[PDB]
Structure 1
Amino acid sequence: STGSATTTPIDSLDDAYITPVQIGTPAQTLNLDFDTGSSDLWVFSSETTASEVDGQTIYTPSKSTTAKLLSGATWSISYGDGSSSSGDVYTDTVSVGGLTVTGQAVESAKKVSSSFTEDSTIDGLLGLAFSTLNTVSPTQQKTFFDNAKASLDSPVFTADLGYHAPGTYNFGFIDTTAYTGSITYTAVSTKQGFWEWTSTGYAVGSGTFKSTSIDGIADTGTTLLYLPATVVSAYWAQVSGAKSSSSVGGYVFPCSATLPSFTFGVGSARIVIPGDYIDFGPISTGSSSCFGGIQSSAGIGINIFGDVALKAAFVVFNGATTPTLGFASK
């Protein structure tokens, strides 16, 4: 089997992407944030504290003839940005772009943190990291991909995120029309539960490529590109007036600037992030200070190839017995 679904930016900055997901019988369609940096499929629901729901579409398990309470199971998750959610668990039928999994753990939120409430466009998350990170207790649950894998034509999914435009998540096949040139595959460590890999270096603008190993994660659920402070300083030094602002929380730059591109290595291949992808606009409405899309990972404890990087590529998440990641230009 295969599946194919369009993923759409939630706003004009590509802060996140939402993908429609069918849950239950009859189908209830919720718009979920596909997150290769976590492993829980959780939703706003009829069980979510009412004051914490503000515009989201909710899953109502009592209206699904295929929903079953997973007795005794609870979940609780905290994300790198300080947001969180928790609740109980149902199993139900879940379909993405025509690909159906029966008995998928659907984690129903009883509580969500303010950042989730405040984002009316995101009805929940669909985790696509390794199932070892799943938070359900006392019986850990599998991701949608893990459950689908054996049925897929090939044990892969691909992320093709758009810049200020829709893109695509495919399951079970590689669309050879969706990228240019060849796909370069690189090794993955699953030791921390992430799609963790090592970039071979970087360049800033038309500058020379610096060969240096950068361990990090391919994370569709993180907006920005978080890299070592040395790398990030080298980038922003090429933008007149750019500076790190402790008050704002990262590098800012004059909105009048033209940003250089940023290249990252994948083996001997190179992915070029155009400068415009690195612009996250005014820090506050009407400001002439703009927020940068490349930020330091210092104090995160891990480098993160988030949407800024991934949307410059066609990305293969290969869930074969030995997982790998592939990147192509597009």
Structure 2
Amino acid sequence: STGSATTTPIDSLDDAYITPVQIGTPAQTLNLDFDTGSSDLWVFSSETTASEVDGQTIYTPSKSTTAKLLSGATWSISYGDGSSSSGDVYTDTVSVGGLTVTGQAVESAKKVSSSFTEDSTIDGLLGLAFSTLNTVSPTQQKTFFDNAKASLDSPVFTADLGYHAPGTYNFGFIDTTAYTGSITYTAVSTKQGFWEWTSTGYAVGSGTFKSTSIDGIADTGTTLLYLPATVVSAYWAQVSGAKSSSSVGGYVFPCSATLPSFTFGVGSARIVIPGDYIDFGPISTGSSSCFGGIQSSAGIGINIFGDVALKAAFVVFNGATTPTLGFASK
């Protein structure tokens, strides 16, 4: 089997991407944030505290003839941005782009933190990291990809995120028309539960490539590119007037600037992030200070190849017995 679904930016900045997912019988379609940095499929629901729902579409398990309460199971998750959610668990039929999994754990939110409530466009998350990170207790549950894998034509999914435009998540096949050149594959460590890999270096604009190992994670659920402070300082030093602002929470730059590109290495291959992809717009409405899309990871503990980086590439998440990642230009 295969599946193919369009993913759409939630706003004009590409702050996140939503993909329609069918849950239950008859289908209830929710728009989920596909997140290769986590491993829970959770949704706003009929069980979510009413004051914490503000415009999201909810899953109502009592209206699904295939929903079953997973007795005794609860979940609770905290994300790197400080947001969180928790609740109970059903199993139900879940389909993405024509690919169907029966008995998928659908984690129903009883509580969500304010940032989820405040974002009416995201009805939940669909985790695509390794199932070892799934938070369901006392019986850990498998991701949608883990459940589908054996049925797929090939044990892979691909992320093709758009810049200010829709893109595609494919399951079970590699669309050879969706990228240019060849796909360069690179080793993955699953020891932390992430799609963790080592970039071979970077360049700023037309500058020379610096060969240096940068361990980080391919994370579709993180908006920005978070890299070591040395690398980030070298980038922003090429932008007149750019500075790190403790009060704003990162590097800002004059909105009048033209940003240089940023290149990262994948083995001997190179992925170029155009400068425009690094502009996240005014820090507040009407400001001439703009927020940068490359930020320091020094306070995180891990480097994160988030959407800013991934949207410049066609990305293969290879879930073979020994997982690997592939990157192509597009």
TM class by shorter chain equals over 0.9
User: Alpha-carbon deviation of 1:252?
Assistant: 0.0
Secondary structure of the 1:140 match is coil
Counterparts of 1:309 and 1:297 in 2: how far apart (Å)?
Answer: 14
Tell me the C-alpha RMSD between the 2 structures.
0.1
Partner residue, 2:68: 68
TM-score by length of 2: 1.00
Looking at structure 2, the residues matched to 28 and 130 of structure 1 have their Cα atoms a distance apart, in angstroms, of 26
- Partner of 1:285: helix, strand, or coil? coil
In the TM superposition, residue 16 of structure 1 has moved relative to its aligned partner by 0.0
Residue 231 of structure 2 aligns to a residue in which SS?
helix
Distance 2:129 2:119 in 1: 23
**Superimposed CA distance per residue, residues 26-74 of structure 1 (whole angstroms, 9 cap, x where no aligned partner):** 0000000000000000000000000000000000000000000000000
- Following superposition, the deviation at residue 280 of structure 1 comes to 0.1
Q: 1:215 and 1:319 mapped to 2: Cα distance?
A: 19
Aligned to 1:144: 144
Structure 2 matches for 1:113-132, cutoff 5 A? 113-132=113-132
Residue by residue over 1:213-271, the C-alpha shift from the partner in whole angstroms, topping out at 9 and shown as x without a partner, is 00000000000000000000000000000000000000000000000000000000000
| Residues in 1 aligned to 2:298 and 2:76: alpha-carbon distance in whole angstroms | 26
Q: For 1:77, what is the secondary structure of its paired residue? A: strand
Deviation at 1:124, TM superposition (A): 0.0
Deviations 1:276-297 (A, max 9, x none): 0000000000000000000000
Tell me which residue corresponds to 1:41.
41
Which consecutive residues of structure 1, in runs of 5 or more, have no partner in the other structure? none
Offset from partner CA, 1:107-148 (integer Å, 9 cap, x none): 000000000000000000000000000000000000000000
Match for residue 295 of structure 1?
Answer: 295
Give the SS at the match of 2:132. helix
Residues in 1 aligned to 2:271 and 2:115: alpha-carbon distance in whole angstroms: 32
Match of 2:233 in 1: 233
Deviations 1:184-218 (A, max 9, x none): 00000000000000000000000000000000000
| Cα distance, 1:172 vs structure 2 | 0.0
Separation in 2 of the partners of 1:164 and 1:145?
A: 26
- Mapped to 2, the partners of 1:91 and 1:72 lie a distance apart of 13
Partner secondary structure for residue 145 of structure 2: helix
> What SS is found at the alignment partner of 2:202?
strand
Find the residue that maps to 2:252 and give its secondary structure.
Answer: strand
Q: Secondary structure at the match of 2:51?
A: helix
1:134 is the counterpart of 2:149: no
Residue of structure 1 in register with 2:191 after alignment: 191
**Distance in 1 between residues matched to 2:17 and 2:160, nearest whole Å:** 11
Query: Structure 2 CA distance, aligned partners of 1:299 and 1:306?
Result: 16
Aligned equivalents of 1:22, 1:281: Cα separation in 2: 33
SS of residue matched to 2:56 = coil
Paired residue secondary structure (2:106): strand
Partner Cα distance (1:189, 1:288) in 2 = 41
Question: Aligned partners of 1:228 and 1:167: how far apart in 2?
Answer: 28
Q: Distance in 1 between matches of 2:225 and 2:233?
A: 13
Q: Secondary structure, in 3 states, of the residue corresponding to 1:51?
A: helix
Name 1:318's counterpart in structure 2.
Answer: 318
Distance 1:149 1:210 in 2: 37
Residue 146 of structure 1 aligns to a residue in which SS?
A: helix
Supply the distance in 2 between the matched residues of 1:94 and 1:27 (Cα, whole angstroms). 9
Deviation at 1:299, TM superposition (A): 1.4
Measured after TM superposition, the shift of residue 149 of structure 1 is 0.0
Partners of 2:256 and 2:163 lie apart in 1 by 20
Q: How many residue pairs were aligned?
A: 330
In the alignment, the residues of structure 1 paired with residue 12 and residue 183 of structure 2 have an alpha-carbon distance, to the nearest angstrom, of 29
TM-score, length basis structure 1: 1.00
Distance 2:148 2:166 in 1: 24
Percent of aligned positions with the same letter in both sequences? 100
- Secondary structure of residue in 2 paired with 1:136: coil
Matches within 5 A, 1:25-174: 25-174=25-174
Alpha-carbon offset, residue 96 of structure 1: 0.1
Please give the secondary structure, in 1, of the residue aligned with 2:191: coil
Task: Give secondary structure in 1 for the equivalent of 2:271.
Answer: strand
Which structure 2 segments of 5+ residues have no match?
Answer: none
What's the CA shift for 1:164? 0.1
